[PDB]
Design a protein around this ligand. Sequence first.
Ligand SMILES: [Mn+2]
Ligand code: NA
Length: 603
Amino acid sequence: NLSAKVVQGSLDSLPQAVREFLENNAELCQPDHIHICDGSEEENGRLLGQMEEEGILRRLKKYDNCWLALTDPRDVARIESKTVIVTQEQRDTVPIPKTGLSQLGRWMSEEDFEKAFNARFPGCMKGRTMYVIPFSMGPLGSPLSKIGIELTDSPYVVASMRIMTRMGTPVLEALGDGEFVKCLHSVGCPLPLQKPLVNNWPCNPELTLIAHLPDRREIISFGSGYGGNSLLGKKCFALRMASRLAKEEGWLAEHMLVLGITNPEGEKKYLAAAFPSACGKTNLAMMNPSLPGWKVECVGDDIAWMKFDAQGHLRAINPENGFFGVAPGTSVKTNPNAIKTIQKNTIFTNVAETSDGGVYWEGIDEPLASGVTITSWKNKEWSSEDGEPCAHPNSRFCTPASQCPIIDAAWESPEGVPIEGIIFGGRRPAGVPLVYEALSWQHGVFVGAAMRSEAKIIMHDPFAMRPFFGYNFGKYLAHWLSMAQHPAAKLPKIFHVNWFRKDKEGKFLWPGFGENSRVLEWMFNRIDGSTKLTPIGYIPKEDALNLKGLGHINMMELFSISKEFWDKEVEDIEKYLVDQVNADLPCEIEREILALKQRISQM
Ligand SMILES: [Mn+2]
Ligand code: NA
């Protein structure tokens, strides 16, 4: 029966629980075939060809084994309005706010999700193949890694997951009879197609819904083929579901890159940073530092799982296997290590294509050769003159982590790396200095809680987890606060940075990119035990920041803290936190809000 539809692998080699999960959903989804993925090169190569024949991907002949997917323009991004978490009680998932709808999560009742589900999945894979992706989040076979099984009817998903996770037969062997996260995904276009297909990219924007059911350990996603919505081990599992597991079992799952930096005397520290949208995350994680004798190496550019070890050090591991980076704005100048990374074995999505088979995008900063022309991400001849970008602004590259020329030697050590500093941020055109340090752990938690970033709109993105909390943010804030009562904890120092402060003409006060290494240098030396006290925390004292080799920098304006800007800031932060967090806001946070007000009132 079922075995008759299997075109690769054997039902009988799957652990029984994996087999039951597959059986239950094949019966539900009614796919024409079952493909058990093995993770092999040969399978990958096979699936690429198949994808090329069908028009899903094009070869990028300028490079070694790169491919380009173009999507339906209705499906170009993770969509938060269609993303929900499902729990018996609303409060376990989001706080009940004082006014408005919560912006800290979107809960759906189990009754509502059951109707939503039944309206979408039965028969959804008719006419297509159901692929079975065994994948590990974390180095294969570690005790501290978690495994999932994602069923999908999208080969683009398979190939992306092979890069972004460890996938294939070795994960099934490691999993044996263990537990796993059940992940079900369908693009939602059963054949025969009921609606047109744009660029050979199936999606069902109307019914798109990305659900998480933490008590069942299930992620169920329907109707988008796009990254955050389809690659379920990354945002769905490694951030949302995990942040909730972590709150239960003593650890943290966070939206942080992790880098190791070494000073000219050979001392090395690992730092973690949580930044909101469009703040240069990959750019910092794989920075080529400008300061002589300094070295930066990349552990991860997006997510980190962290847990206190036996001596109380917070150790991080990057549960991903690759980088799903925003492409526009990537160039040799801004991120030479990212460029080198994506020179081969990479999938690109919604970027532009040169006539010689290369890629292109806003900010790539690479003159075209005489006669080379550009095809945009909508498949049309393109020119600067048309008044739309040649690449979608959320376009991506999906690339093996092992290819980063500065990948850290410890990026896959199953014991993780010891975090000595955590860095929060955002895009703040006015008011917020280049760097400041927290006064205490509780104050550091409040700094993360207070994060805002200009996306002409400025929004709150606390800890850069606003779209990703797996559970009540007030409870997450308690969970972080409680780290300070962990026996012998060695708490990382907390900082906040802003690469985007502008003068009155809107020009950047700070050059950023490699020059950010000057700011990392000061944090590094602060971790080693100097400062100038201000109401918002410590900034570097006069002349402490290393400016050698830079053109002029307006230090005074860059580090300026005005009472008036900050009177409004703290009023905004208070309003936000008391309104959105309400009955769940920890008293430690309340005290930090008041204290900042008190300090600001003293200026
Ligand atoms: Mn991210
Ligand atoms: Na997005």
